[PDB]
Amino acid sequence: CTSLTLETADRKHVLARTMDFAFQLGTEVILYPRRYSWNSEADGRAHQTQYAFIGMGRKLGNILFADGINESGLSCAALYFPGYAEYEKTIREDTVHIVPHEFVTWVLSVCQSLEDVKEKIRSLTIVEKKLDLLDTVLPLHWILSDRTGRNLTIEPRADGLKVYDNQPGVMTNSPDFIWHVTNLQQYTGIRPKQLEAFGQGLGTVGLPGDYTPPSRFVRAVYLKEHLEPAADETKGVTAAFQILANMTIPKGAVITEEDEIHYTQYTSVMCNETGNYYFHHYDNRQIQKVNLFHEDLDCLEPKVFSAKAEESIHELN
Amino acid sequence: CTSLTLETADRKHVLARTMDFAFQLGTEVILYPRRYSWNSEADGRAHQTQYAFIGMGRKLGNILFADGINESGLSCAALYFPGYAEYEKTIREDTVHIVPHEFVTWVLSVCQSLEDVKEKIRSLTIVEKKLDLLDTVLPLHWILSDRTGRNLTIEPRADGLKVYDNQPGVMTNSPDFIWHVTNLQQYTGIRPKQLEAFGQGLGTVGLPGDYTPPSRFVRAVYLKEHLEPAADETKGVTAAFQILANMTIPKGAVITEEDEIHYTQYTSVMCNETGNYYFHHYDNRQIQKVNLFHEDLDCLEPKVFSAKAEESIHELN
Amino acid sequence: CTSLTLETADRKHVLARTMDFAFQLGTEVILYPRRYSWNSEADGRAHQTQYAFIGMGRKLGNILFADGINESGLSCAALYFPGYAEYEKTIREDTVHIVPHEFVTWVLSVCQSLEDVKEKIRSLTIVEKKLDLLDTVLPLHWILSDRTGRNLTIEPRADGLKVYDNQPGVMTNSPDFIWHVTNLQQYTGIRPKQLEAFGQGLGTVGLPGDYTPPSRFVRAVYLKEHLEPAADETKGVTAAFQILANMTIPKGAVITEEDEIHYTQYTSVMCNETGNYYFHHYDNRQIQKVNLFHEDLDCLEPKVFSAKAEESIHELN
Amino acid sequence: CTSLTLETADRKHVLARTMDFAFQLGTEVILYPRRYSWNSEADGRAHQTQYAFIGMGRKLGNILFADGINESGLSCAALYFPGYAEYEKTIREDTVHIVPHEFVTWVLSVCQSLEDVKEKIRSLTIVEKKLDLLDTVLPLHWILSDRTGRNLTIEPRADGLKVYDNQPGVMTNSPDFIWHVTNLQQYTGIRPKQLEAFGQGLGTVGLPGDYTPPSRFVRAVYLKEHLEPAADETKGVTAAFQILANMTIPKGAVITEEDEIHYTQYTSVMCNETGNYYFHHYDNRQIQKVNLFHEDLDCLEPKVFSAKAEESIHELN
């Protein structure tokens, strides 16, 4: 997965991410409403959501989310972090306990901002527990965004939960966040204009083209840094998709250790100010959209907005 | 520009191309009908079209085409070829004379197949003449496709018009076609599966990521060669777009000598068997489609199918 | 600079390094004898050497060493580490205080092995103090070796002296050691034999060619990992030079921010077991050698072995 | 193999080359005297040498040369050119016939300059014939130099002997010469000084590091283009070795299809004006020299100057 934030000329923010995976997740955009009672798989204890939100989710016992945007402008995305993610084995105490795949639900339901996350996260404990559908502990890390325009990355390490100001506003997968930010120093020579002619693009030589996390990180940062400013929310959504097109894996390009096809299943963009969640997916290019605020946020139960599944083609004749 | 052919499991062919440029071309899909009389800018002599077709075009005196698919399955795309394209200065005789920006119109209107092109092209002469809108001679070369599944590339050189079997079924810009095909030998090590773990993609290391023509050529060939087979026309169109997403230039990424923004304005896919022309453009992700055969091909004049210009967003609520 | 250890088949060990700089250092190989009194620029306090050693140095008040090999088989090399080196600003107490440029003298004069290093270093303080010649505090980090065949890299950080087991037996410059070892994971696909014909070397595609520190680190690990075993000392010394030839900077190839030419001035190889110091420099390819043990190690004063400066040419006729 | 010419400030010229192979060639520097009779493996016909020369060769019936420098300042080197070399299968007439491995002997024995080459070659036929030792027809191409400072590369193709002015003064192996010169256009952004801090060398990012022929060609052009001027012959010879250090293959780094180790066996530098042949080999770094003119150039038979085989170490104590 590749994620990035962008800021438009009229001052909105979006958080955008591709979801690259071999197993089919079958996520759909879902409203998780306010005052919704759920029980953690860490210890069975009950929680009650405070803020409503929408994001890509799947009912697996509770409804687990890969990302989402809440009613107060906080947005979050969970991306794979294999080999680096390390959780608590032993249940602490005087802490809330959740499992890794609950963090999105937690943070979006209980926090209203980045300041808020930085504070509540001090009494949280994420513990090592499998996701049955996969029979494995999800190795994850998270990128978050709110209406101040700041960005965080949060990474569950052996040393505990680490929080970073994410200045580039980009994040992919392993290794750890400082590693990637340091790696950017190798790439400050790539630039849009040639120095002083098969065609255009020569300044761009050295941009990594492969699908490894470090290269996708560098290629996102390059394209974000030289993006012509986008005027408004819609133009921002387009740009985030244009950039993420460059990190879209066609089926067949990448094969896992198990002979599975690792490809981009969906790409989404979430707008912090407007509560809009846009997306397309491998099989349908047309942007789809859910507006959080058209819904009854005191709804009694989750609401699913199911997607158009095939290529939506506009016939001119 | 990046172009490529693909073949689906049910045996259709598509020819796909991005159109990367700094100046706004304002092309629209247009039907050029059968028996349509036009006069060449080479010498003023009259021609009469034999085959109807559709492609991206612009009225500039006559309607000039950047690509197109005709009523008998021949498809063609003109891509920039700067510094390498060389035309006839002196008007020969016993030949048809056209200017570079007429080749698409010519070949699509007068030829019914690749065999046919290879034969008619022997009595053709392309002469050096400007395109007024640009006050410059277009340096171009062409990729063509028909229902046999073969592909050609044709390149106007100092030595005359050169014709190549295009075995990879890919073409970008300069330098010449054999140069790129030879350059592919450097890249046969890139592969979808790692040898024997920040994540996926490690076999893919070395894939060029920059926007130069040679790198776009290599990156297209890689993605075409490892594309999981596409089952039918629609799935083929999706795949061609998924591959070309990887060669889509966001505004700002690439700047010309003149400080202009060189970006991908539109991407199209043309199906040889069905006469369908699909496309999207920088500002609207949704595929748009014109079916050649729904039209009256004996129409008296060109017909324009003008495109939806803004982002067509499907609202789920 | 690039440094690396090697093991020969007869189980000797060598530590090797190029010295890349813009300022002409003018090091010569010097013997520092045992029981030699000196005083630290840190605080003026007395030191008495315990172990004799040889290495490239220069008299600049006391005699400053870039590297060396001692009588009991410990070797060390100091390499530039700009932006990351961080020393103690304030004098602690109950500790031995030295300045950065005295580390090599200290460690080699006082320690008899890597174990001995890991223990004495626990009560060392390195303090921020300028080298006068250059009017700057040297940013440095160190690689060390002994007769056990283990290796260490020691890096002065904000948080204190960090000590790492150096498994690859390679170090260049910035960034920090764990950064580099982590970065090697992107390069595990590079390999001597092609997969399945311009010539040889296609498996090697991807090896970094530039002179930046991360690139030279990866290229040294590749070459060392795949070196055929060297039978003995001489062969070990040859091999080390053959590898480091690949990270040798000719004059003009790299230019600093101040417009100075930054180039490889000398290359040395030290054998741990035999106290042999071999080198060559930019202007004389022939290997030159100093045998620590041929000298009186109790000598009252340091002894300089000045290099043949010109290309030493063997004339066959 | 990698080869390159250099010009010194005092206007001497050198032609330099590494010899990379898997089979041990066992060349020694040999003087081929003037007025020496030999017969071609092509047809048994008589030849009488006109100009004495020295170069690395081996007695294999006649004495076969990989390179050399003649008495009137012409230099040549033969380098592998697999897949692209194409000789004459049938014996022509009114032409001098030779086999591939006799080119160096022929050109150097009979031609006094590059002009003289371009003229005599008009009536040369190179015929397909095996070298027995290897049971294969050598695929070869050649770079040449004289006292004018011009350079040529000559490549045996399907279509005849092609002769090119070699502006860069560099040649490696396959593919063809114009291929490489064209490929240099992708690399014009590489440069000694950074744009606007792990260390030095950031402008150099992008220089190819692998051992394939196109990569070594680009790396040699970069280094030669940016070499500081060498004051005189000796300095020229040093510089040539410093450059070619960067294309020096240690044992194990590259492995052939047959599982043989392909490594740099020797490196030579020939000065055109002075008939000086310098070299070193894998096992002995010290430069060794043969002075063509110290010999009797009318000598009745060839004379071998056998190399110091072991590392020649200069002992300072």
Curated annotation (Swiss-Prot), chains A, B, C, D:
* PANTHER family, per the entry: CHOLOYLGLYCINE HYDROLASE (PTHR35527), HYDROLASE (PTHR35527:SF2)
Q: Which GO terms describe its molecular function?
A: hydrolase activity
Q: Could you say how this protein's activity is regulated?
A: Penicillin acylase activity is enhanced in the presence of the reducing agent DTT, indicating active sulfhydryl group in the enzyme. Activity is inhibited by the chelating agent EDTA in a concentration-dependent manner. Inhibited by cephalosporins and conjugated bile salts, substrates of the closely related bile acid hydrolases. Progressively loses activity with increasing concentrations of the denaturant guanidine hydrochloride.
**A GO biological process held by the record:** response to antibiotic
Q: What class of enzyme is it?
A: hydrolase
Q: Active-site residues? A: C1
The enzyme's E.C. designation? 3.5.1.11
List the Gene3D superfamilies hit by this protein, alphabetically. Answer: Penicillin V Acylase, Chain A (3.60.60.10)
The species this protein belongs to is: Bacillus subtilis (strain 168)
Task: Indicate the quaternary assembly.
Answer: Homotetramer.
- Catalytic activity annotation: a penicillin + H2O = 6-aminopenicillanate + a carboxylate
| Presence of the UniProt keyword Lyase in the record | no
Q: Which InterPro entries does its entry note?
A: CBAH/NAAA_C, Ntn_hydrolases_N, Peptidase_C59
| Stated name of the protein | Penicillin V acylase
State a single Pfam family of this protein: CBAH
